[PDB]
């Protein structure tokens, strides 16, 4: 017993025409006058755009007049004049209408692509449906005699045909006719009549306009809009507050368009009415009833022909639909130019003494007012007003432990934006911890992030436990750790090993720390001798606990006292003895992988800490003298001169080919740039002599920028080969190479020929970086706009098939292995083992456990794995189906966000994209991604049988291949151009090649298999990363791919109407309740269906999601016409109507109110 | 054909939309903005389909629509407008002559004018009104006297009739007599749409036979008893509706005596009227389509003023339309000028007023104009800007009306305009929200509420209830010294002495004191 008639919470929105009556329900009066506010007394007129009894009042509770002013009467209306003293915001939830005369044409349900008046009324439209409401051709409403029921008549046919008969055809022209037209219609027995005869002895000539209109009819009528609606006699008005006219600086006010536009409307209406009492010449009234359609057309929606200007303004007017058709600020924000704070923790982060003052005001009013000090809360303004020192220690409580998380520009990946614990800075600008420096991609170029305040609890909680940086060790990418040590630390570290010979040497021996005390009291240097010392190491094993195991082994001073930051467990000191490079990443991705959270969070804060204080202590620097030249470099490239002399000489006097003798010596030079990259390099390496004990020796350079480039720190072989070596083979503007390539070098001179050579790779460099990254960016809206939806759900569904994992092996012919790809990945079932046993079912590989897979040899190369590709899932995704890959080592959260995060770990990298039978780059990952067909797609073999030549060009034609066998042929078209693979006679397989050439993504998913086309997706979109040199995981690729082949097409049947193709989302649902449910019979079976991200993101049930990125006017005005209801599962359509997201820390409420909303 | 080939076959898929291909490829008038939407709505989103949706489908301009249907000429000449309006004359006079037939119409004016003397010369009304009333009063008595069986006794009436064409009535009473006249008439085929729907429908008896019957007297019940007493299978349920077509005849009847005229012929009076009304109004419909030339052209030099075309010459259509309406074929002057004046005046009286957003007065459009056209010869009969000081001084205004009359030019500007240009920026998206309070603003009202709230409780009841009732708090409407001072039996001195007391006990706290700033 509830029907409850307030404003609750709502489960769903509905969408709909809207009838005369419907208007009239939000109408609170009618708009009369045309005029607005008035000249003098700037007071909104009677019946005008800003009624006051019609709309709101404009001051808050007292009336127009001033009969009433306070309190005393806010349910009251007045007496003298009718206004209700409430609010002023009713002023801006007040409706009001305005009654037309003669109809009106809705221009949306009127020229909106497909004519939805036309179309549900059989019709053309911009050619009749135009010219008989124009006021030029007379149309029919239904005759028995001579005439049909929608023909179109000129004045002369009309007085013609009405002679003949008349009085018992009559049919108007014009709106109202139309609307006779519309509303005399029976969507009923059309419906019924329709079905009879679109299926008498037709085939596939007629089928298609039949199977269109019916479902479209069906969907109308069952909507329960009445086509009457369709064109209106009854236009409603938007709310004054929503189009207001406010004086702005010195008089000059400031309206807005729509305002104009109701005033136009309104004054033809006024003049129409009028002459519809007065004398009424044909022309003279039925031009004003066109003015009348301009005018409301106009206000509806400009669009689209010819535009009304007016308002002095030379641009058009933002009508209605321009106001809903194609960035929300916020409070308690900020932002600074951000700052390096080495001396913070990786929870930490520099916020301003003043910025955060005025963040958390009211934080610091409410404990203020809490404690004492301020007697009330204007008191607390003050006092924080006037900074009274007192004030800057309450603000110490208020930041204690209130999170605050930060935010870079572009915001490519998850890891955009960070929580911190707000530490007080002295200062004006943000400070970051340089750990996370990388993940932002932000540099101290001087670049600027923004600060938020997380003000609700579990909004603090939220940023706590989910954007803390102490949460985000890994990237959602790649397994592999994110804040891992850069450039500085990196470097340090790599100083820290370096085993030098002798110098200050000598094996002498003690324990660990105790070498600390030797450093500092110098004797003894540091990058020696080696030297050997008692190393404690801890293990752990079967039960786990600890056990120790001292030793004597054989490392250096850096290594001895860097022992020390190593946590409990690890193998210790070998990861120690290696050296600065990638293994100090390594380090800390087996820490935590072997330890946790927290030792491997601390673990970084120690090894950030020493690096940047032994790279303090080293001072590495950067003198004229550290790049040095090799002597070889004038002989080479004199060399290579001598070479390209002769090939000249060759070429003048004919003998080898001119034509491309250009390539050749292009190798010649580019020859000679190995030559001298090589001598360089292997100069800069080793050299160096030393003088162990007895002299002589050789280790690899201390040269400073060696040290730099062999231990990342930002400095690479290309770069280091054009400080010293040369720059090779320069770009020329046409594209081609040029045959002189820069062989001076930045330690030398540079001429100025050269210069204006290397200018042109410069600027193509810098522009197409500009390029690149807003076409990453262009794709991964594509990509979180397909994939945005789905969300790990129902826990652990069953189902054992999957892709059988295998290591992708070039090696075929070029030698390439990569078996790290299965990780964190639920087993299908038990995958053998070369005897028996071992793997279980759905044991998911462990880190350790993907270590045992070496154990069994390399025998082992194939395991079966569930992946999101398959899944018996519904409408989310398994967990145990997907993995674990996250910052978290465990497996995904039970209703994360998997969408989002594959999106943005595929989009992220995008930045670092080269565009361009290779494509290659992003634009090959988006074709792929499109599911797009090659510009010479190969043909299979859809059915195994006997090949053979299918009359030789007899069409048309071009060949034939006829391969037939068992039963039923099948006749393939060759268009001659390109030529074969397999001669006459021979038999082939189910897909087998017969083109030798690019294959379609299409064919391979119809005919090969879904495993295929999804293996083959997911290998062929990587192979443009690996060039590129770009870790991602194939997860996320599963997962986008997983929603790409979302649909499917139906072909025999069932309750659904075969040639609709539809999503085996209701597919499977609908199949699973029907064998059991009365009989298999009256369903049919399904084929997956290929289609791109923008097809497959095109579809989808929401319609205010929809609304979202597709074209508005479109989506919005075919929801209406069907009586459609969002409710209200997506994430997007749940994000602007403000409310829980249906994911993460919300899901909970969302399937509570789900199940909730199963009573009715 | 061609279109749906070229455009097909070409389109596959065009690769980047090339838009600047087929659009030429069409016929027509080009460079139009309404074609250019159904191109950019098949190619994609729905391909394949759309492709074949789009040919099914092609399987302008109000203005020039509207020269169309103007472009029927049927243009007159001297002869042909005083022809048309000889024609409106002759319908009007028709019209009146049938008023004057009626009786009630001049008693009715005769009522309405002892109205007028109970309260244009005075004496000249009572000297016409009388000649009225005389004829009158002479022609009522030859009626029921039937002398001269209404032979020179209809002399009488037309003579009378000829007097009540003397009068010259208003545009208002004029309607409102016809009006009365045709409700007159709603009535009596009201009745005898009555008698007729009951007696044929209900009563089972056939059109021919009540055509038959009926016509005859309409009002005596000679022929419905005559009806009955035929023995007809279709006279036994006239039985069922007797009372009913008694019932219409009696108020028929009492219609007869309330016209005071032969029933058998009000039919022919209000018909001959009608006919009129229909002549003079399809002549003048004649005269305003011929002239519809004129509007157009003398429109075409207001254009372009705060407001469009169409509306401007539509405005010129129906100052037109006034124009027919008061204009005589037997007039020296011709309907070209007379009737440009008329539209000069319709359309400017349009301009004046429903033009710009906010309000104004055709003085103020005016004076607005006149000061325009005064400036823009004090830049160029000098040398320098017109000073707004000088500019006021060679007018009768002061200065200061000027400056205020400034202040209401333009529409003025629209929020949508472009400004900073960034991504993008709004003229009304810098406009700050005034009429809302600050959360800290509201904040410290709800916390000053408490504050007093607990400041009048260390307080005496008698001295709470004082401060809170005289100062009107808690409590709506507030109280003076002496609505006070009656419900505390002492008066006025003794309470504002306790009223000021509290304000003694509000000197050592700093709650209120802090809230003060
Ligand atoms: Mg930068
Ligand atoms: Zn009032
Ligand atoms: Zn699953």
Redesign the pocket.
């Given at each position: 017993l509830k029907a409850q008639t307030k404003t609750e919470e709502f489960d769903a929105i509905k969408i709909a025409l809207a009838s005369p009556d419907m208007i009239r329900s939000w109408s609170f009066g009618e708009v009369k006058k045309p005029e607005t506010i008035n000249y003098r007394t700037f007071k909104p007129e009677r019946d005008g755009l800003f009624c006051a009894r019609i709309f709101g009042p404009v001051k808050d509770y007292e009336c127009l007049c001033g009969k009433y002013k306070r309190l005393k009467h806010r349910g009251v209306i007045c007496e003298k004049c009718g206004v209700e003293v409430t609010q002023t915001k009713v002023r801006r939830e007040r409706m009001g209408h305005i009654e037309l005369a003669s109809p009106t044409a809705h221009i949306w349900f009127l020229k909106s692509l497909p004519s939805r008046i036309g179309l549900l009324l059989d019709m053309p439209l911009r050619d009749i449906e135009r010219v008989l409401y124009f006021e030029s051709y007379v149309v029919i409403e239904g005759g028995m005699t001579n005439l049909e029921r929608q023909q179109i008549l000129t004045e002369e046919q009309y007085l013609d045909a009405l002679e003949e008969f008349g009085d018992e055809f009559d049919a108007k022209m014009g709106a109202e006719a139309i609307q006779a037209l519309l509303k005399s219609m029976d969507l009923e027995q059309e419906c019924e009549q329709l079905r009879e005869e679109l299926n008498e002895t037709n085939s596939e000539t007629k089928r298609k306009k039949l199977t269109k209109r019916i479902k479209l009819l069906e969907a109308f009528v069952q909507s329960g809009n009445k086509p009457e609606w369709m064109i209106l006699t009854v236009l409603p008005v938007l709310p004054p507050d929503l189009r207001p006219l406010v004086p702005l600086d010195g008089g000059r006010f400031a309206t807005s368009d729509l305002n104009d536009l109701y005033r136009r409307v309104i004054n033809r209406n006024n003049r129409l009415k009028r002459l519809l009492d007065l004398a009424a010449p044909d022309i003279i009234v039925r031009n004003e009833k066109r003015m009348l359609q301009e005018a409301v057309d106009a206000l509806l929606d400009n669009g689209r022909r010819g535009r009304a200007i007016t308002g002095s303004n030379k641009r058009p007017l933002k009508s209605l639909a321009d106001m809903i058709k194609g960035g929300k600020r916020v409070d308690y924000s900020g932002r600074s130019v951000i700052t390096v704070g080495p001396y913070l923790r990786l929870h930490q982060c520099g916020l301003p003494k003043k910025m955060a003052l005025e963040l958390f005001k009211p934080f610091i009013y409410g404990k203020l007012e809490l404690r004492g000090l301020a007697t009330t809360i204007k008191a607390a303004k003050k006092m924080v007003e006037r900074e009274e020192a007192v004030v800057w220690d309450i603000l110490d409580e208020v930041i204690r432990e209130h999170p605050v998380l930060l935010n870079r520009a572009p915001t490519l990946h998850r890891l955009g934006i960070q929580a911190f614990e707000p530490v007080l800075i002295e200062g004006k600008a943000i400070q970051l911890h340089p750990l996370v420096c990388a993940a932002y991609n932000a540099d101290f170029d001087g670049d600027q992030m923004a600060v938020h305040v997380p003000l609700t609890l579990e909004a603090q909680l939220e940023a706590r436990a989910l954007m803390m940086s102490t949460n985000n060790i890994l990237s959602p990418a790649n397994g592999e750790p994110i804040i891992v040590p850069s450039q500085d630390v990196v470097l340090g570290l790599y100083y820290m090993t370096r085993d030098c010979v002798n110098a200050k040497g000598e094996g002498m021996v003690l324990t660990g720390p105790k070498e600390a005390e030797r450093l500092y009291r110098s004797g003894l240097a540091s990058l020696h001798a080696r030297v050997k010392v008692r190393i404690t190491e801890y293990e752990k094993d079967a039960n786990g606990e600890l056990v120790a195991k001292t030793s004597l082994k054989d490392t250096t001073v850096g290594r001895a006292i860097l022992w020390m930051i190593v946590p409990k467990g690890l193998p210790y000191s070998i990861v120690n003895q290696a050296l600065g490079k990638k293994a100090i990443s390594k380090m800390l991705n087996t820490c935590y992988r072997i330890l946790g959270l927290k030792p491997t969070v601390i673990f970084a804060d120690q090894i950030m800490y020493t690096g940047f204080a032994y790279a303090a202590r080293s001072g590495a620097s950067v003198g004229i003298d550290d790049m040095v030249i090799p002597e070889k470099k004038h002989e080479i490239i004199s060399e290579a001169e001598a070479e390209v002399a002769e090939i000249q000489e060759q070429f003048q006097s004919g003998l080898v080919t001119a034509g491309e003798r250009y390539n050749k010596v292009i190798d010649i030079w580019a020859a000679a740039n190995d030559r001298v990259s090589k001598a360089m390099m292997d100069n800069l390496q080793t050299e160096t002599v030393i003088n162990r004990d007895g002299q002589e020796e050789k280790q690899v350079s201390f040269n400073s920028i060696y040290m730099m480039a062999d231990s990342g720190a930002r400095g690479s072989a290309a770069q280091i080969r054009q400080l010293a070596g040369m720059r090779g083979l320069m770009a020329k503007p046409d594209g081609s190479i040029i045959e002189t390539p820069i062989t001076a070098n930045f330690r030398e001179g540079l001429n100025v020929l050269q210069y204006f050579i290397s200018t042109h790779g410069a600027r193509k460099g810098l522009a197409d970086t500009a390029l690149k990254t807003a076409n990453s960016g262009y794709l991964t809206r594509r990509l979180v706009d397909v994939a945005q939806d789905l969300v790990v759900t129902e826990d652990?569904?069953?189902?054992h098939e999957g892709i059988m994992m295998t290591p992708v092996i070039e090696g075929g012919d070029v030698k390439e292995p990569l078996r790290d790809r299965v990780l964190g990945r639920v087993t299908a079932e038990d995958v053998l083992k070369p005897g028996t046993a071992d793997i279980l079912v759905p044991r998911n590989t462990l880190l350790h456990e993907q270590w045992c897979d070496l154990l069994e040899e390399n025998s082992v190369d194939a395991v079966k794995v569930?992946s999101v590709v398959?899944?018996?899932?519904d409408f989310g995704?398994?967990a145990?189906?997907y993995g674990r890959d996250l910052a978290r080592g465990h497996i995904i959260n039970k209703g994360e966000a998997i969408g989002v995060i594959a999106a943005q770990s595929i989009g992220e990298p995008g930045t670092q994209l080269t565009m361009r039978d290779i494509t290659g780059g992003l634009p090959r990952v988006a074709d792929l991604f499109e599911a797009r067909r090659p510009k010479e797609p190969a043909i299979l073999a859809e059915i195994s049988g006997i090949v053979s030549f299918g009359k030789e060009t007899k069409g048309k034609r071009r060949l034939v291949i006829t391969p037939v066998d068992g039963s039923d042929p099948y006749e393939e078209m060759i268009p001659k151009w390109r030529q074969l693979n397999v001669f006459e006679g021979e038999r082939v397989e189910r897909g087998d090649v017969i083109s030798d050439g690019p294959e379609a993504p299409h064919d391979i998913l119809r005919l090969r298999g879904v495993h295929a086309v999804t293996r083959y997706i997911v290998n062929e979109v990587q192979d443009v990363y690996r060039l590129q040199g770009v870790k991602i995981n194939d997860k996320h690729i599963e997962v986008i791919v997983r929603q790409m082949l979302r649909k499917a097409t139906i072909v025999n049947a069932g309750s659904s109407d075969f040639l609709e193709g539809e999503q085996v989302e209701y597919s499977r649902v609908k199949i699973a309740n029907r064998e059991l449910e009365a009989n298999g019979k009256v369903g049919a079976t399904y084929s997956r269906d290929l289609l791109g991200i923008t097809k497959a993101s095109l579809a989808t049930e929401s319609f205010i999601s929809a609304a979202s990125f597709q074209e508005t006017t479109r989506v919005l005005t075919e929801a209406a016409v069907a009586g459609k209801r969002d409710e209200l599962r997506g994430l997007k359509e749940n994000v602007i109507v403000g409310r829980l997201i249906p994911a993460g820390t919300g899901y909970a409420y969302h399937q509570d109110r789900m199940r909730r909303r199963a009573a009715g | 054909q061609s279109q749906l080939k070229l455009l097909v076959t070409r389109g596959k898929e065009q690769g980047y939309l090339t838009y600047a291909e087929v659009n030429d490829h069409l016929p027509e008038d080009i460079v139009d903005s309404d074609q250019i939407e159904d191109i950019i709505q098949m190619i994609n989103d729905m391909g394949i389909q759309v492709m074949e949706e789009a040919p099914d489908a092609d399987d302008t301009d109000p203005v020039r629509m509207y020269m169309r249907e103007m472009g029927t000429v049927e243009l007159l000449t001297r002869e042909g407008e005083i022809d048309i309006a000889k024609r409106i004359e002759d319908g009007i006079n028709q019209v009146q002559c049938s008023v004057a037939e009626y009786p009630e119409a001049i008693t009715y004016l005769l009522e309405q004018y002892d109205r007028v003397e109970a309260e244009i010369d005075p004496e000249l009304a009572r000297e016409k009104f009388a000649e009225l009333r005389a004829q009158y009063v002479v022609t009522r008595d030859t009626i029921k006297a039937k002398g001269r069986s209404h032979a020179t006794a209809q002399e009488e009436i037309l003579k009378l009739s000829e007097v009540f064409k003397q009068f010259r009535l208003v545009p208002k009473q004029f309607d409102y007599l016809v009006n009365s006249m045709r409700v007159m008439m709603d009535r009596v085929r009201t009745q005898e749409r009555l008698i007729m729907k009951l007696c044929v429908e209900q009563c089972k008896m056939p059109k021919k036979n009540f055509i038959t019957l009926f016509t005859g007297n309409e009002t005596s019940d000679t022929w419905f008893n005559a009806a009955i007493a035929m023995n007809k299978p279709w006279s036994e349920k006239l039985h069922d509706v007797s009372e009913e077509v008694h019932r219409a005849l009696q108020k028929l009847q009492q219609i007869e005596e309330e016209t005071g005229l032969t029933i058998e012929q009000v039919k022919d009076i209000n018909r001959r009227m009608s006919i009129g009304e229909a002549k003079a109004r399809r002549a003048k419909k004649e005269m305003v389509e011929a002239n519809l030339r004129l509007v157009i052209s003398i429109a075409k030099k207001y254009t372009n003023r705060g407001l469009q075309f169409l509306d401007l010459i539509q405005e010129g259509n129906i100052g037109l339309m006034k124009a027919v309406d008061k204009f005589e074929y037997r007039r020296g002057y011709k309907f070209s000028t007379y009737a440009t004046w008329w539209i000069r005046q319709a359309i400017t009286r349009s301009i004046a007023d429903q033009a710009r957003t906010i309000r104004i007065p055709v003085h103020m459009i005016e004076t607005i104009n006149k000061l325009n056209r005064i400036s823009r010869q004090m830049l160029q009969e000098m040398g320098r800007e017109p000073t707004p000081e000088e500019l006021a001084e060679r007018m009768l205004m002061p200065e200061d009306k000027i400056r205020k009359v400034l202040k209401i030019a333009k529409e003025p500007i629209s929020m949508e305009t472009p400004i900073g240009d960034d991504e993008d920026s709004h003229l009304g998206d810098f406009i700050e929200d005034t009429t809302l309070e600050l959360p800290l603003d509201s904040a410290t009202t709800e916390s000053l509420r408490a504050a007093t709230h607990d400041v009048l409780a260390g307080l005496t009841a008698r001295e709470a209830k004082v401060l809170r009732m005289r100062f009107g708090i808690d409590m709506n409407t507030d109280y003076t010294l002496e609505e006070v001072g009656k419900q505390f039996d002492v008066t006025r001195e003794r309470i504002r002495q306790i009223e000021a007391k509290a304000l003694r006990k509000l000197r050592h706290p700093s709650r209120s004191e802090v809230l003060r700033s």
């Amino acid at each position: 017993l509830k029907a409850q008639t307030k404003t609750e919470e709502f489960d769903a929105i509905k969408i709909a025409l809207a009838s005369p009556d419907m208007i009239r329900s939000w109408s609170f009066g009618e708009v009369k006058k045309p005029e607005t506010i008035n000249y003098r007394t700037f007071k909104p007129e009677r019946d005008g755009l800003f009624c006051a009894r019609i709309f709101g009042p404009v001051k808050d509770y007292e009336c127009l007049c001033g009969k009433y002013k306070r309190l005393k009467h806010r349910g009251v209306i007045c007496e003298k004049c009718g206004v209700e003293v409430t609010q002023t915001k009713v002023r801006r939830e007040r409706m009001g209408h305005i009654e037309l005369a003669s109809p009106t044409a809705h221009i949306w349900f009127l020229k909106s692509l497909p004519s939805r008046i036309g179309l549900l009324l059989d019709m053309p439209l911009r050619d009749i449906e135009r010219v008989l409401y124009f006021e030029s051709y007379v149309v029919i409403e239904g005759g028995m005699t001579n005439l049909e029921r929608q023909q179109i008549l000129t004045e002369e046919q009309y007085l013609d045909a009405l002679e003949e008969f008349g009085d018992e055809f009559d049919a108007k022209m014009g709106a109202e006719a139309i609307q006779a037209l519309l509303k005399s219609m029976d969507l009923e027995q059309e419906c019924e009549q329709l079905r009879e005869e679109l299926n008498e002895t037709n085939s596939e000539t007629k089928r298609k306009k039949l199977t269109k209109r019916i479902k479209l009819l069906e969907a109308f009528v069952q909507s329960g809009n009445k086509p009457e609606w369709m064109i209106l006699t009854v236009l409603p008005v938007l709310p004054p507050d929503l189009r207001p006219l406010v004086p702005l600086d010195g008089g000059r006010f400031a309206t807005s368009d729509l305002n104009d536009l109701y005033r136009r409307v309104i004054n033809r209406n006024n003049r129409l009415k009028r002459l519809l009492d007065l004398a009424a010449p044909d022309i003279i009234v039925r031009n004003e009833k066109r003015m009348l359609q301009e005018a409301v057309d106009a206000l509806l929606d400009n669009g689209r022909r010819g535009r009304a200007i007016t308002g002095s303004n030379k641009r058009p007017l933002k009508s209605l639909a321009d106001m809903i058709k194609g960035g929300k600020r916020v409070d308690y924000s900020g932002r600074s130019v951000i700052t390096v704070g080495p001396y913070l923790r990786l929870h930490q982060c520099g916020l301003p003494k003043k910025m955060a003052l005025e963040l958390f005001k009211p934080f610091i009013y409410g404990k203020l007012e809490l404690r004492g000090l301020a007697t009330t809360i204007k008191a607390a303004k003050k006092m924080v007003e006037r900074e009274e020192a007192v004030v800057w220690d309450i603000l110490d409580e208020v930041i204690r432990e209130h999170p605050v998380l930060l935010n870079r520009a572009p915001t490519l990946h998850r890891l955009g934006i960070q929580a911190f614990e707000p530490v007080l800075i002295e200062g004006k600008a943000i400070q970051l911890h340089p750990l996370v420096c990388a993940a932002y991609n932000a540099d101290f170029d001087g670049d600027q992030m923004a600060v938020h305040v997380p003000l609700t609890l579990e909004a603090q909680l939220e940023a706590r436990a989910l954007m803390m940086s102490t949460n985000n060790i890994l990237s959602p990418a790649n397994g592999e750790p994110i804040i891992v040590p850069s450039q500085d630390v990196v470097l340090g570290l790599y100083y820290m090993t370096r085993d030098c010979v002798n110098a200050k040497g000598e094996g002498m021996v003690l324990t660990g720390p105790k070498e600390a005390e030797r450093l500092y009291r110098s004797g003894l240097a540091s990058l020696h001798a080696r030297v050997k010392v008692r190393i404690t190491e801890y293990e752990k094993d079967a039960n786990g606990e600890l056990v120790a195991k001292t030793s004597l082994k054989d490392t250096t001073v850096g290594r001895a006292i860097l022992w020390m930051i190593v946590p409990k467990g690890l193998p210790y000191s070998i990861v120690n003895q290696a050296l600065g490079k990638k293994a100090i990443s390594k380090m800390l991705n087996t820490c935590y992988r072997i330890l946790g959270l927290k030792p491997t969070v601390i673990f970084a804060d120690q090894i950030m800490y020493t690096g940047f204080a032994y790279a303090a202590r080293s001072g590495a620097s950067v003198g004229i003298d550290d790049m040095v030249i090799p002597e070889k470099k004038h002989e080479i490239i004199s060399e290579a001169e001598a070479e390209v002399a002769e090939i000249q000489e060759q070429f003048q006097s004919g003998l080898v080919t001119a034509g491309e003798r250009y390539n050749k010596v292009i190798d010649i030079w580019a020859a000679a740039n190995d030559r001298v990259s090589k001598a360089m390099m292997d100069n800069l390496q080793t050299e160096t002599v030393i003088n162990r004990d007895g002299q002589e020796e050789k280790q690899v350079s201390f040269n400073s920028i060696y040290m730099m480039a062999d231990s990342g720190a930002r400095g690479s072989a290309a770069q280091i080969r054009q400080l010293a070596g040369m720059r090779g083979l320069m770009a020329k503007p046409d594209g081609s190479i040029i045959e002189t390539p820069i062989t001076a070098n930045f330690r030398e001179g540079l001429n100025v020929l050269q210069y204006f050579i290397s200018t042109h790779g410069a600027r193509k460099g810098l522009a197409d970086t500009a390029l690149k990254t807003a076409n990453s960016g262009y794709l991964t809206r594509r990509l979180v706009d397909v994939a945005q939806d789905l969300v790990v759900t129902e826990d652990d569904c069953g189902t054992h098939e999957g892709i059988m994992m295998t290591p992708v092996i070039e090696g075929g012919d070029v030698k390439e292995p990569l078996r790290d790809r299965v990780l964190g990945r639920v087993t299908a079932e038990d995958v053998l083992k070369p005897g028996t046993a071992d793997i279980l079912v759905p044991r998911n590989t462990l880190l350790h456990e993907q270590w045992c897979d070496l154990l069994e040899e390399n025998s082992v190369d194939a395991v079966k794995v569930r992946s999101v590709v398959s899944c018996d899932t519904d409408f989310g995704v398994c967990a145990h189906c997907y993995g674990r890959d996250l910052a978290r080592g465990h497996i995904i959260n039970k209703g994360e966000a998997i969408g989002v995060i594959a999106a943005q770990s595929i989009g992220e990298p995008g930045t670092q994209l080269t565009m361009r039978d290779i494509t290659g780059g992003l634009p090959r990952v988006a074709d792929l991604f499109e599911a797009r067909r090659p510009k010479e797609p190969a043909i299979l073999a859809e059915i195994s049988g006997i090949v053979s030549f299918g009359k030789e060009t007899k069409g048309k034609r071009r060949l034939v291949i006829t391969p037939v066998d068992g039963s039923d042929p099948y006749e393939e078209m060759i268009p001659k151009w390109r030529q074969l693979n397999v001669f006459e006679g021979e038999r082939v397989e189910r897909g087998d090649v017969i083109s030798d050439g690019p294959e379609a993504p299409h064919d391979i998913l119809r005919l090969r298999g879904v495993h295929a086309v999804t293996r083959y997706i997911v290998n062929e979109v990587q192979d443009v990363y690996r060039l590129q040199g770009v870790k991602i995981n194939d997860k996320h690729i599963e997962v986008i791919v997983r929603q790409m082949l979302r649909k499917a097409t139906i072909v025999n049947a069932g309750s659904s109407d075969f040639l609709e193709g539809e999503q085996v989302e209701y597919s499977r649902v609908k199949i699973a309740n029907r064998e059991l449910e009365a009989n298999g019979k009256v369903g049919a079976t399904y084929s997956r269906d290929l289609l791109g991200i923008t097809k497959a993101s095109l579809a989808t049930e929401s319609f205010i999601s929809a609304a979202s990125f597709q074209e508005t006017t479109r989506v919005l005005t075919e929801a209406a016409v069907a009586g459609k209801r969002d409710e209200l599962r997506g994430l997007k359509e749940n994000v602007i109507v403000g409310r829980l997201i249906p994911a993460g820390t919300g899901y909970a409420y969302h399937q509570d109110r789900m199940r909730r909303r199963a009573a009715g | 054909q061609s279109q749906l080939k070229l455009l097909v076959t070409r389109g596959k898929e065009q690769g980047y939309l090339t838009y600047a291909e087929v659009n030429d490829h069409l016929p027509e008038d080009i460079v139009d903005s309404d074609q250019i939407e159904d191109i950019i709505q098949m190619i994609n989103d729905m391909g394949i389909q759309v492709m074949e949706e789009a040919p099914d489908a092609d399987d302008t301009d109000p203005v020039r629509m509207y020269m169309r249907e103007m472009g029927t000429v049927e243009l007159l000449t001297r002869e042909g407008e005083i022809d048309i309006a000889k024609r409106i004359e002759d319908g009007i006079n028709q019209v009146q002559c049938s008023v004057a037939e009626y009786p009630e119409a001049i008693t009715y004016l005769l009522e309405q004018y002892d109205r007028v003397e109970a309260e244009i010369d005075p004496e000249l009304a009572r000297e016409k009104f009388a000649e009225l009333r005389a004829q009158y009063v002479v022609t009522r008595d030859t009626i029921k006297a039937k002398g001269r069986s209404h032979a020179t006794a209809q002399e009488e009436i037309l003579k009378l009739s000829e007097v009540f064409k003397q009068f010259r009535l208003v545009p208002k009473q004029f309607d409102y007599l016809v009006n009365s006249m045709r409700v007159m008439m709603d009535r009596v085929r009201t009745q005898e749409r009555l008698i007729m729907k009951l007696c044929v429908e209900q009563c089972k008896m056939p059109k021919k036979n009540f055509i038959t019957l009926f016509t005859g007297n309409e009002t005596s019940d000679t022929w419905f008893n005559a009806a009955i007493a035929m023995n007809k299978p279709w006279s036994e349920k006239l039985h069922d509706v007797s009372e009913e077509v008694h019932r219409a005849l009696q108020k028929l009847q009492q219609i007869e005596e309330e016209t005071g005229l032969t029933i058998e012929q009000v039919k022919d009076i209000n018909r001959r009227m009608s006919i009129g009304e229909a002549k003079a109004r399809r002549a003048k419909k004649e005269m305003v389509e011929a002239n519809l030339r004129l509007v157009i052209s003398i429109a075409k030099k207001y254009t372009n003023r705060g407001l469009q075309f169409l509306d401007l010459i539509q405005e010129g259509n129906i100052g037109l339309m006034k124009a027919v309406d008061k204009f005589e074929y037997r007039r020296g002057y011709k309907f070209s000028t007379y009737a440009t004046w008329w539209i000069r005046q319709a359309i400017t009286r349009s301009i004046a007023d429903q033009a710009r957003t906010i309000r104004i007065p055709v003085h103020m459009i005016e004076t607005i104009n006149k000061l325009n056209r005064i400036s823009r010869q004090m830049l160029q009969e000098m040398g320098r800007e017109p000073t707004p000081e000088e500019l006021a001084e060679r007018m009768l205004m002061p200065e200061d009306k000027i400056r205020k009359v400034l202040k209401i030019a333009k529409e003025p500007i629209s929020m949508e305009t472009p400004i900073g240009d960034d991504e993008d920026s709004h003229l009304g998206d810098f406009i700050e929200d005034t009429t809302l309070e600050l959360p800290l603003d509201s904040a410290t009202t709800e916390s000053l509420r408490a504050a007093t709230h607990d400041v009048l409780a260390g307080l005496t009841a008698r001295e709470a209830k004082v401060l809170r009732m005289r100062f009107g708090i808690d409590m709506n409407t507030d109280y003076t010294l002496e609505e006070v001072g009656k419900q505390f039996d002492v008066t006025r001195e003794r309470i504002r002495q306790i009223e000021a007391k509290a304000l003694r006990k509000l000197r050592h706290p700093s709650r209120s004191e802090v809230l003060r700033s």
